[PDB]
Amino acid sequence: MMRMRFGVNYTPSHGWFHFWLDPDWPSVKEDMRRIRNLGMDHVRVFPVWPYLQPNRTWINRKAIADVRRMVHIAGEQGMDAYVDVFQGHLSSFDFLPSWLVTWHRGNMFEDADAVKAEKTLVAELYGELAQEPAFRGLTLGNELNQFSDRPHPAKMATSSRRIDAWLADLLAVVDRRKHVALHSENDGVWYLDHHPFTPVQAANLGDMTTIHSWVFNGTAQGYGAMSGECTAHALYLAELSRAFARNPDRPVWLQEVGAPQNVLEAEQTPEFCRDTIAKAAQCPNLWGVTWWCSHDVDSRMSDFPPFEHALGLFDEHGNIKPIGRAFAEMAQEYRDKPAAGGNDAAVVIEVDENGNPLNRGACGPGGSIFERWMRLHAEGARPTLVTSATARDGEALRRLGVTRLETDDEPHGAKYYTAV
Amino acid sequence: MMRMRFGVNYTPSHGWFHFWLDPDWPSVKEDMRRIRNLGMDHVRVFPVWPYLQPNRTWINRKAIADVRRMVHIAGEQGMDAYVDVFQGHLSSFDFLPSWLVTWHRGNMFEDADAVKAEKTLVAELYGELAQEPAFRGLTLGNELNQFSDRPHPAKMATSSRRIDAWLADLLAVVDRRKHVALHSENDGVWYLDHHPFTPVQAANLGDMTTIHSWVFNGTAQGYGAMSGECTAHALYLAELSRAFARNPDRPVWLQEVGAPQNVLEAEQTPEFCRDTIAKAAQCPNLWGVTWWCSHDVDSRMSDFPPFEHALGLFDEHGNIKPIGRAFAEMAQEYRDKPAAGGNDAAVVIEVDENGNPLNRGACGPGGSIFERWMRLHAEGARPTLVTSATARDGEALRRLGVTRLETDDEPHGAKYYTAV
Numbered sequence: 001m002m003r004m005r006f007g008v009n010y011t012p013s014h015g016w017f018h019f020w021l022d023p024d025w026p027s028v029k030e031d032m033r034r035i036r037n038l039g040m041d042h043v044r045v046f047p048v049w050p051y052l053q054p055n056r057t058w059i060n061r062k063a064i065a066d067v068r069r070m071v072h073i074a075g076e077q078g079m080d081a082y083v084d085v086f087q088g089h090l091s092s093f094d095f096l097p098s099w100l101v102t103w104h105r106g107n108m109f110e111d112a113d114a115v116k117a118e119k120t121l122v123a124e125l126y127g128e129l130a131q132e133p134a135f136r137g138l139t140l141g142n143e144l145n146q147f148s149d150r151p152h153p154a155k156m157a158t159s160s161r162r163i164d165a166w167l168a169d170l171l172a173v174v175d176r177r178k179h180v181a182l183h184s185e186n187d188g189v190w191y192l193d194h195h196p197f198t199p200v201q202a203a204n205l206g207d208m209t210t211i212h213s214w215v216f217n218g219t220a221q222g223y224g225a226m227s228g229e230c231t232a233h234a235l236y237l238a239e240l241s242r243a244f245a246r247n248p249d250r251p252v253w254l255q256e257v258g259a260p261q262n263v264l265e266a267e268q269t270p271e272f273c274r275d276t277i278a279k280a281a282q283c284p285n286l287w288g289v290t291w292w293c294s295h296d297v298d299s300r301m302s303d304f305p306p307f308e309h310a311l312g313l314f315d316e317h318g319n320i321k322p323i324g325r326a327f328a329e330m331a332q333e334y335r336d337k338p339a340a341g342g343n344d345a346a347v348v349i350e351v352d353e354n355g356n357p358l359n360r361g362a363c364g365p366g367g368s369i370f371e372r373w374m375r376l377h378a379e380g381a382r383p384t385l386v387t388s389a390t391a392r393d394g395e396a397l398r399r400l401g402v403t404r405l406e407t408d409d410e411p412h413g414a415k416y417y418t419a420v
Numbered sequence: 421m422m423r424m425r426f427g428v429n430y431t432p433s434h435g436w437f438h439f440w441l442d443p444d445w446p447s448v449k450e451d452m453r454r455i456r457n458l459g460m461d462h463v464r465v466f467p468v469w470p471y472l473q474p475n476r477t478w479i480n481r482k483a484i485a486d487v488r489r490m491v492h493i494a495g496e497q498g499m500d501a502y503v504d505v506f507q508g509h510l511s512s513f514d515f516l517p518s519w520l521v522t523w524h525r526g527n528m529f530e531d532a533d534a535v536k537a538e539k540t541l542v543a544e545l546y547g548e549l550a551q552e553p554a555f556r557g558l559t560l561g562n563e564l565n566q567f568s569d570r571p572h573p574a575k576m577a578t579s580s581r582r583i584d585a586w587l588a589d590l591l592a593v594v595d596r597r598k599h600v601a602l603h604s605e606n607d608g609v610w611y612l613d614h615h616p617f618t619p620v621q622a623a624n625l626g627d628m629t630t631i632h633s634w635v636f637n638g639t640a641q642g643y644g645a646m647s648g649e650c651t652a653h654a655l656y657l658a659e660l661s662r663a664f665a666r667n668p669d670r671p672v673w674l675q676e677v678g679a680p681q682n683v684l685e686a687e688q689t690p691e692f693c694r695d696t697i698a699k700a701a702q703c704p705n706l707w708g709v710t711w712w713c714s715h716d717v718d719s720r721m722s723d724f725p726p727f728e729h730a731l732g733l734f735d736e737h738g739n740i741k742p743i744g745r746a747f748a749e750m751a752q753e754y755r756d757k758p759a760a761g762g763n764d765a766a767v768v769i770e771v772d773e774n775g776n777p778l779n780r781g782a783c784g785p786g787g788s789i790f791e792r793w794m795r796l797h798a799e800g801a802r803p804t805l806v807t808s809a810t811a812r813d814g815e816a817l818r819r820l821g822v823t824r825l826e827t828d829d830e831p832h833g834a835k836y837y838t839a840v
Contacts, residue, residue, distance in 0.1 A: 018474040021441075022482035050470065054438040057722040062442035093518040099723050101521070102514045102573050113722075153522050154574070302477040302533075303519050 002339065004281070005288030006331035007042035007079070008035055009256060010070075013295045013318055017090055020051050023066055025073070032077035034314060035294055038328040041335070042080040044255065044290055045070055046087050046142065050097045052125070056117045059124050068128045075134025083129060084184070085122055086141030091297070091308050094147075107156040109148060109166050122173040130179065137180030139210060139255070140170050145185040145197035160196045160354075167205045182206040184255060187217055190240055191364030191417055193357075200355045203244035208287060211237045212256035213276075216307075218365035220263035222416030229365075229374050231275040236373055238283040240363060243349055243385040244356075248399055251287035254280055258292035259323060262307040270326035277330040282382065284340045291327050342401020343384040347372045348408065351387045364414025372406055422759065424701070425708030426751035427462035427499070428455055429676060430490075433715045433738055437510055440471050443486055445493070452497035454734060455714055458748040461755070462500040464675065464710055465490055466507050466562065470517045472545070476537045479544050488548045495554025503549060504604070505542055506561030511717070511728050514567075527576040529568060529586050542593040550599065557600030559630060559675070560590050565605040565617035580616045580774075587625045602626040604675060607637055610660055611784030611837055613777075620775045623664035628707060631657045632676035633696075636727075638785035640683035642836030649785075649794050651695040656793055658703040660783060663769055663805040664776075668819055671707035674700055678712035679743060682727040690746035697750040702802065704760045711747050762821020763804040767792045768828065771807045784834025792826055 012019035014027040035043065045067070052063045071081040086108075087095055100106040100114065108114050122138070129135040147156045148163070158166075167183055174181035183206050189197045203209050213234035215225075223229035238252045257276060259269035273291075280286055296312035297304060309316075313324030347369055350358045362369045369385070376383035381404070390396045391405050432439035434447040455463065465487070472483045491501040506528075507515055520526040520534065528534050542558070549555040567576045568583070578586075587603055594601035603626050609617045623629050633654035635645075643649035658672045677696060679689035693711075700706055716732035717724060729736075733744030767789055770778045782789045789805070796803035801824070810816045811825050 015478070016475075018478055018480065021471055021474060021480050051441055054441060055436075055721045055723070057720055058435070058438055058718075060438065060441050092523055094522045094524075095518050096521075098513040098515050101516075103512055104514075104723055105573065153525065298478075300477055301475045303475070303524055 003336055004286060004334050005041055006327070006335055007040045007044065007288065007290045008294040008313065009290055009292045010035070010043040010045050011293040011295045011297065011312065013314070013316070016297050016301060017046055017048055017087070020048050020063065020066060025069065028070060028073050029077065030318070031295065032073055032079065034318065034320075036077045036079055038313065038320070038324060039331045039335075040079060042082060042136070042288070042290070043074050043294070044082045044084065045074070046084050046090060048095050049086050049088055050095055053097055053117065053121050055097070056099045056113060059121055064125055064128050067125065068132060071129055071132045071135050075132060079134065080136045081132075081134050082136050082139065082180070083125070084139045084142050085125060086118065086144060088141040089143055089146050092305055101154075105154070107158070109156055109158040109162060115166065115169065119170060119173055122170055126174055130175070135179065137182065137207070138174060139182040139184045140167070142184055143186040143212065144183075145188055145195065148196050149188070149192070158196045160198050160201070163196050164201060164205070167201060171206055176207060180207040182208055182210055182253070184210045184212065186212055187214065187237065190237060191360055191414055193360045195360070198354070198356045199241070199244040199360070203241045203250065204246055208251040208253045209241045209245065210253050210255040211241060213237050213254060214256070214258065214260060216260045216263045216420070218414065218416030218420045221420065222366050225264050225268065228378055231272060232279050232374060232377055234276050235279040235282055235377070236370070238280060238286055239373070239384045242283075242285060243387050243390070248396070250285060252283060252285045253287050254289045256292040257289060258311045260307050261310050262305065266310065269323045273323050273326045274330060277334065281334050281337070282340050284342065286339070289330075343382045344401060345376050345381040345383045345404040345406065346386040346391070346400070346402045347376065347383060347406050348391045349385055349387050350408070351389060355387065355389070359411050359413070361413035362408060362411045364417040366415035366417060367413055368408050368411045370414065372408060376406065423756055424706060424754050425461055426747070426755055427460045427464065427708065427710045428714040428733065429710055429712045430455070430463040430465050431713040431715045431717065431732065433734070433736070436717050436721060437466055437468055437507070440468050440483065440486060445489065448490060448493050449497065450738070451715065452493055452499065454738065454740075456497045456499055458733065458740070458744060459751045459755075460499060462502060462556070462708070462710070463494050463714070464502045464504065465494070466504050466510060468515050469506050469508055470515055473517055473537065473541050475517070476519045476533060479541055484545055484548050487545065488552060491549055491552045491555050495552060499554065500556045501552075501554050502556050502559065502600070503545070504559045504562050505545060506538065506564060508561040509563055509566050512725055521574075525574070527578070529576055529578040529582060535586065535589065539590060539593055542590055546594055550595070555599065557602065557627070558594060559602040559604045560587070562604055563606040563632065564603075565608055565615065568616050569608070569612070578616045580618050580621070583616050584621060584625070587621060591626055596627060600627040602628055602630055602673070604630045604632065606632055607634065607657065610657060611780055611834055613780045615780070618774070618776045619661070619664040619780070623661045623670065624666055628671040628673045629661045629665065630673050630675040631661060633657050633674060634676070634678065634680060636680045636683045636840070638834065638836030638840045641840065642786050645684050645688065648798055651692060652699050652794060652797055654696050655699040655702055655797070656790070658700060658706055659793070659804045662703075662705060663807050663810070668816070670705060672703060672705045673707050674709045676712040677709060678731045680727050681730050682725065686730065689743045693743050693746045694750060697754065701754050701757070702760050704762065706759070709750075763802045764821060765796050765801040765803045765824040765826065766806040766811070766820070766822045767796065767803060767826050768811045769805055769807050770828070771809060775807065775809070779831050779833070781833035782828060782831045784837040786835035786837060787833055788828050788831045790834065792828060796826065
């Protein structure tokens with residue numbers, strides 16, 4: 001039996017991620033019941049790091065128990081749960097423990113004591129969550145690369161070689177025979193040159209590539225909210241990641257996709273959802289789609305970019321929105337549909353000695369790789385992306401189905417990403 | 421009936437200020453019972469700001485209820501409670517809500533939205549705590565001036581005129597006919613030139629001057645841990661504050677005094693406690709002494725400066741330490757003792773047009789004002805400090821009892837404070 005997973009990034013209706021400071025467990029049961037009734041098979045859930053580990057060597061066991069309870073409830077309501085360990089960063093807000101800031105400013109990637117503490121938290125949380133049948137695995141943390149580089153205003157500077165080791169060290173805490181171990185970056189991993197988190201890491205470390213597809217990154221602005229490029233963005237990132245995966249069967253998890261109203265109109269979000277998913281399903285390696293997010297953010301909360309409030313499938317009073325009905329329809333259409341087949345054409349990405357692009361910028365919105373892929377997509381050529389090494393490997397190309405290659409003869413950067 | 425108050429800064433034995441993430445209420449009852457049995461009449465308690473107000477306009481009502489419960493338990497165990505609203509800063513750690521840091525970096529003194537949110541939290545917390553008979557009042561927050569100036573690594577720059585208005589605006593939330601309203605600075609208020617929190621504010625805004633006396637500020641280092649200057653430091657700050665109080669009856673609350681083992685030996689702390697209090701009681705305006713702190717910090721917690729762990733009157737297993745017995749003895753000796761009388765001599769501090777010292781640095785450890793006062797103290801002259809304006813006011817001097825004035829003929833700065 002084969003299938004494509006459909007789920008939601010769970011934003012608790014009662015308190016958002018401030019829920020953890022005053023858990024209302026009946027509200028989680030109700031949230032989960034309504035999510036399940038959309039036809040969802042999983043949730044992604046987000047504990048908050050300063051509550052889990054308020055001192056470097058003081059892990060709050062009640063906070064761990066609360067994560068386990070939320071997982072337990074998802075399972076009672078018929079769904080699997082995936083947990084992100086270190087938040088870290090959510091919806092424009094940084095949540096760091098006090099032992100990593102100001103007078104205690106630290107580097108979560110480089111400092112041995114911080115790394116030991118991170119591993120201890122992963123092990124303690126994992127050891128509890130592994131006891132829940134609904135628990136499927138963990139992602140180290142949401143978009144943690146946003147701490148590692150400009151323009152973060154208090155960055156934790158690092159390097160790709162250090163991140164290779166840091167990722168491997170934390171992923172090794174999980175028994176990957178029983179549970180997935182994943183890591184997550186924002187699209188800087190694909191689009192930013194000299195960024196210490198890299199395409200090769202994203203597409204080879206951990207059990208699946210995670211993608212977070214957000215068309216406010218210049219795609220909607222540069223091509224139009226009602227453009228084909230806009231609805232193709234998630235498919236594009238999935239295919240881009242395949243260029244770098246050494247395992248041709250590696251699953252791609254569209255771990256976040258949302259319909260952001262800073263660039264889209266509310267009335268267009270159901271169609272954007274359907275079209276984005278229908279395009280993403282053209283990727284033979286697409287393992288699942290997890291919508292951002294389950295529930296609108298309470299209008300009483302301030303300082304969010306306004307569109308963040310409206311990203312739910314359910315409104316702030318718990319009632320299904322038109323986009324929720326659309327996502328339910330897509331799950332019904334695609335969860336059991338046979339995976340797509342091969343790809344006839346590929347755009348070639350020249351890579352350095354480590355297998356990463358010489359020019360990541362050309363892969364972002366407005367860039368030359370991006371636009372060549374978009375053109376082949378519009379023409380119906382079912383393009384993928386391959387590296388210059390793969391382009392010399394007839395057997396690898398045969399496995400992909402690729403019989404036509406397009407080179408990037410005059411590369412240029414991501415003019416619409418940088419304008420953002 | 422007159423009396424001098426004796427109490428403790430309450431550090432919960434079960435989790436320190438991480439207690440609030442998983443309250444163990446039986447442990448608070450036991451902590452409070454043991455504190456009361458030392459002969460204490462009050463506690464100072466510290467909620468944590470990111471738990472009270474995790475979003476600018478999302479006040480966690482359960483966190484408020486937990487503060488009220490802690491106050492309620494203190495009262496059930498026979499004691500009054502004073503609450504600090506915004507922590508803020510505790511024992512080297514900054515606890516800021518995510519809406520004031522990094523991508524949301526804000527200025528808690530200057531930004532209108534932050535100030536409105538602060539006032540809302542004070543009003544909500546005060547409205548609940550006012551319903552508890554044991555609640556006596558609130559301090560805006562512990563040593564909040566540490567955010568306002570160098571060397572804070574992410575400071576919130578401001579000015580003394582703005583702080584005048586900010587303090588008044590927040591203090592006005594309290595009904596001062598029924599409860600005290602106070603503010604608290606570290607000793608930078610007394611010792612640092614050009615610092616936006618000032619002696620005049622400390623000694624005139626709010627109902628009592630709060631002093632936090634810490635001999636690791638250069639006093640023990642420069643004069644010796646076993647010196648008279650070391651044990652006179654709390655008295656000195658009390659008398660220094662009187663120079664700036666326009667109300668000659670204003671109470672001085674020694675709101676923190678501890679025996680820090682980065683500069684003192686463990687075996688000396690009981691004698692340091694007794695001698696410091698016997699000297700402080702020479703101040704006729706001394707209203708109370710609140711020891712820092714009730715309970716040692718659990719040895720399992722890391723990144724504290726090591727001496728912080730040992731500042732308790734009770735050890736980390738709840739058992740009384742020799743210093744706890746000494747503090748109990750001092751409370752028994754002084755709680756009902758008639759206040760001291762007048763002061764025969766005063767050192768004169770030249771002041772600017774606002775009434776603040778021209779040279780605050782000369783008032784710190786190693787400074788010329790500090791050392792002149794210390795010399796008169798050693799001689800038995802019972803010195804106080806007066807401003808240059810008071811030194812011209814025969815009636816004010818008569819009220820103080822002062823018949824001798826000493827001017828600071830060759831001022832110099834606080835060489836031992838700055839060396840720290």
